[PDB]
């Protein structure tokens, strides 16, 4: 019998919080997209990377979260083999997409403050970089979709990734290690270094209050990305360290917690846009 049949009250509470995050984030990011596109004044080459970030984040909270949560209710796949391959492709790509979109906005913000005279990335090159981000995202998510399978367990359908069988599980482990390094350590370094130097110059009279606000915003972003994604990565690297923890029931509630913290990152950006910028706030109150 499926041991992951959490009590009704547990289901209710988890549902509530998850629901709150999902709704708030998707609505917020969707409003952000609207503000930029609808008001063509705010629709600029500068906001293209912002558009890319918002879009990827919205899709993430809408697809990745709800689907994964319902899966975690009793670990049952209430969808299909096609949806197993789809969920192990689009939502997962959207995760990598969001993180790389953050590196992209951070690079433009570095170039706009550290080297103000050097011109901005050309409009065509800006769109090229967006394309490259989503391309790399799909590439990183491809293996999971290729090895997707809905093993129909008597207890529940489970969408599992059947990695190439290895005695040392070498390919299985390396892929997850490469993802962790590529979408956490590597961004945490670039976004970190860039925002760090920009912060130094901006921190070093109403103008001063605004510049120090930008610095606060940047440190908030860095801490969010690092703290919120670290539990997520640990959980997906856990089977390689302790697989017995997965065989225990408490891991069900732990997966719920890590996904909650990770999907919450798609809410920080909208709030940050309204708090730091005045025009974003105006668009929000108009919508």
């Amino acid at each position: 019998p499926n041991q992951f049949v959490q009590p009704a009250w547990q289901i209710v509470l988890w549902a509530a919080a998850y629901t709150v995050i999902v709704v708030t984030s998707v609505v917020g990011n969707v409003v952000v997209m609207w503000i930029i596109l609808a008001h063509k004044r705010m629709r600029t080459v500068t906001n293209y990377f912002l558009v890319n970030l918002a879009f990827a984040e919205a899709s993430m909270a809408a697809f990745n979260t709800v689907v994964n949560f319902t899966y975690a209710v009793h670990n049952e796949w209430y969808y299909g083999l096609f949806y197993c391959k789809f969920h192990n492709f689009f939502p997962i790509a959207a995760v990598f997409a969001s993180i790389y979109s953050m590196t992209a906005v951070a690079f433009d913000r570095y170039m706009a403050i550290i080297h103000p005279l050097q011109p901005r990335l050309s409009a065509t090159a800006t769109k090229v970089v967006i394309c490259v981000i989503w391309v790399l995202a799909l590439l990183l998510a491809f293996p999971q979709g290729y090895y997707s399978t809905t093993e129909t367990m008597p207890s529940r359908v489970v969408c599992m990734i059947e990695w190439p069988e290895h005695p040392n599980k070498i390919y299985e482990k390396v892929y997850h290690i490469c993802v962790t390094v590529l979408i956490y350590f590597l961004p945490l370094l670039v976004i970190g270094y860039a925002y760090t130097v920009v912060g130094i110059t901006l921190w070093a009279h109403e103008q001063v209050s605004a510049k120090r606000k930008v610095v606060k915003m940047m440190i908030v972003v860095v801490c969010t990305f690092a703290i919120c994604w670290l539990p997520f990565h640990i959980f997906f690297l856990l089977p390689y360290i302790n697989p017995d923890l997965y065989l225990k029931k408490f891991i069900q509630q732990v997966y719920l917690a890590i996904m909650w913290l990770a999907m919450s990152s798609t809410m920080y950006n909208p709030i940050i846009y309204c708090c730091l910028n005045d025009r974003f706030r105006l668009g929000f109150k108009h919508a």
Binding site: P1, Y71, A72, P91, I92, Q144, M153, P154, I161, F235
Partner: peptide
Amino acid sequence: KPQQFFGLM
């Protein structure tokens, strides 16, 4: 494994 929890990124 039926006792194994399966999670997707």
